[PDB]
UniProtKB/Swiss-Prot annotation, chain B:
One GO term of the biological process aspect: mitochondrial electron transport, NADH to ubiquinone
Organism: Sus scrofa (Pig)
Transmembrane regions: 22-42, 60-80, 98-118, 147-167, 193-213, 224-244, 257-277, 284-303, 308-330, 351-371, 391-413, 435-455
GO cellular component terms given for this protein: mitochondrial inner membrane; respiratory chain complex I
InterPro entries (alphabetical): NADH4_N (IPR000260), NADH_Q_OxRdtase_chainM/4 (IPR010227), NADH_UbQ_OxRdtase (IPR003918), ND/Mrp_TM (IPR001750)
Gene from which this protein is expressed: MT-ND4
Ranges in coiled-coil conformation: none
Protein name: NADH-ubiquinone oxidoreductase chain 4
């Protein structure tokens, strides 16, 4: 019975940033539009395709 | 260009599936047909190169060499018939396939649009040549000769590979057309100097340059007759072709960097011809004469004047034919006497008259008797060098003198004098040998009629 998790109705405001964390960095640009064939294929030296 | 490449490839399955009695016949037939087809490429445009496709192109420089290779293959087969007549069918087919692979590689080299593709194929030519020399050689020095040839060529080529990849990274393309239209001058920085050296040294090794020509005597002497034919007719011209192509992006640094190589070649022609004068081996003499004649082309390429390039192309074609013919004649004499000592066989003119006439005509072409294409090229190079510096005429004329001297010396020692008494196995010349000599001489004399075809793109 003393081991049961209990509810507490406190008046103290819930800490907005308890860890005092710094601003997280902006994510890298995610994906893009559709895939299209390579402009000239494998442009590896003499290969044309 | 596939109109030439594809039949050349189709030669291989034919040779592998041809009957043991028909291998040589089929190979010769279809090789001659392929040469006939390649003749169409000679119709070069006045300004634009024949850009068949993105990968293959031809100009008035590439087309004569292509025709030369396609024409050289059948003659090589004819020459190889004699000594490779006791060989088992599989090995004979193997030899024919090596020759066909070499021809295919050379065609692709001369038609490749991309510089790195040219490098790949021009270094691929080593494998068939090495196999031919080391496997079907008659002496014990064949292994060392093959090692020398392979290592010289590779030591030249690998820095060229690095330089070509560097150019691809910087310029963005190695296509000859783009490389020529987007040409940018090179500065005098040490980096540019070493890039120029890397781009030039490989081709300098390919066409024997005095100091780096040690591989040629060994290779030509030890290699079988067909191998020597290609080695002295096309494989050396590979260096000239590559150098003429690559000099487009090596200016104006060429003006400053040519002096070492220019002096080396201008003295080397004299030195090698003098060496020819005092040679005891016939094939070695022919090889050293080749060294001198190629040093002339090296000078012509380094000078970079239009007349020099025209003369260089003409000389390359002429020397290819002449050197191949000389090696064939020496091969016939060697087969009869089983020795390469020049003084061993004497007075052959009495025993074999027609072969002596072939010898005479070949030697006349070697000494550049007017109006042979040999003389046309030599004279053009001489005039270009005279424009470069008047002092050049001294060395050029002396080299002409020494060439005439050693060529006539070869003719006199072999095809003149009292016949050797103990040598009794000199049979009458075979029809095949005479036909080989004729197929070497007649095209050259006909080419003299219309030199414009073999005068290069700067005509």
């Amino acid at each position: 019975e003393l081991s049961k998790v209990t509810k507490v109705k406190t008046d103290r405001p819930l800490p907005e940033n308890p860890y005092h964390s710094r601003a997280r960095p902006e994510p890298n640009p995610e994906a893009e539009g559709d895939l299209k064939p390579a402009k000239h294929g494998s442009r590896l030296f003499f290969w044309t395709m | 260009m596939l109109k030439i490449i594809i039949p050349t490839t189709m030669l291989l399955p034919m040779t592998w599936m041809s009957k043991h009695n028909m291998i040589w016949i089929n190979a010769t037939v279809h090789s001659l047909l392929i040469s006939l087809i390649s003749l169409s490429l000679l119709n070069q445009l006045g300004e634009n190169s024949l850009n068949f496709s993105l990968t293959f192109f031809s100009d008035s420089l590439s087309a004569p060499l292509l025709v030369l290779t396609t024409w050289l293959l059948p003659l090589m087969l004819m020459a190889s018939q004699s000594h490779l007549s006791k060989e088992t069918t599989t090995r004979k087919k193997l030899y024919i396939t090596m020759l066909i692979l070499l021809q295919l590689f050379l065609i692709m080299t001369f038609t490749a649009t991309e510089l790195i593709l040219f490098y790949i194929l021009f270094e691929a030519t080593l494998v068939p040549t090495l196999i031919i020399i080391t496997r079907w050689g008659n002496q014990t020095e064949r292994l060392n000769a093959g090692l020398y040839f392979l290592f010289y060529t590779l030591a030249g080529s690998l820095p060229l590979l690095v330089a070509l990849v560097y150019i691809q990274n910087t310029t963005g393309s190695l296509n000859f057309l783009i490389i020529h239209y987007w040409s940018h001058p090179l500065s005098n920085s040490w980096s540019n100097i070493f890039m120029w050296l890397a781009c030039i040294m490989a081709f300098m090794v390919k066409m024997p340059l005095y100091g780096l020509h040690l591989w040629l005597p060994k290779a030509h002497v030890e290699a079988p007759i067909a191998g020597s034919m290609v080695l002295a007719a096309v494989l050396l011209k590979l260096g000239g072709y590559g150098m003429m192509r690559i000099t487009t992006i090596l200016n104006p640094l060429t003006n400053y960097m040519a002096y070492p190589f220019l002096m080396l070649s201008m003295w080397g022609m004299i030195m090698t011809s003098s060496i020819c004068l005092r040679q005891t081996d016939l094939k070695s003499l022919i090889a050293y004469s080749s060294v001198s004649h190629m040093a002339l082309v090296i000078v012509a390429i380094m000078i970079q004047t239009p007349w020099s390039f025209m003369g260089a192309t003409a000389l390359m074609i002429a020397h290819g034919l002449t050197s191949s013919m000389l090696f064939c004649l020496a091969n016939t004499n060697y087969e009869r006497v089983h020795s390469r000592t020049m003084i061993l066989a004497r007075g052959l003119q009495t025993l074999l008259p027609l072969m002596a006439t072939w010898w005479l005509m070949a030697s006349l072409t070697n000494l550049a008797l007017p109006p042979s294409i040999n003389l046309i090229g030599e004279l053009f190079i001489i005039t270009a060098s005279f424009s470069w510096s008047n002092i050049t005429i001294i060395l050029m004329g002396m080299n002409m003198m020494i060439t005439a001297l050693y060529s006539l010396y070869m003719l006199i020692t072999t095809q003149r004098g009292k016949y050797t008494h103990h040598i009794n196995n000199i049979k009458a010349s075979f029809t095949r040998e005479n036909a080989l000599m004729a197929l070497h001489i007649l095209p050259l004399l006909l080419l003299t009629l219309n030199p414009k075809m073999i005068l290069g793109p700067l005509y």
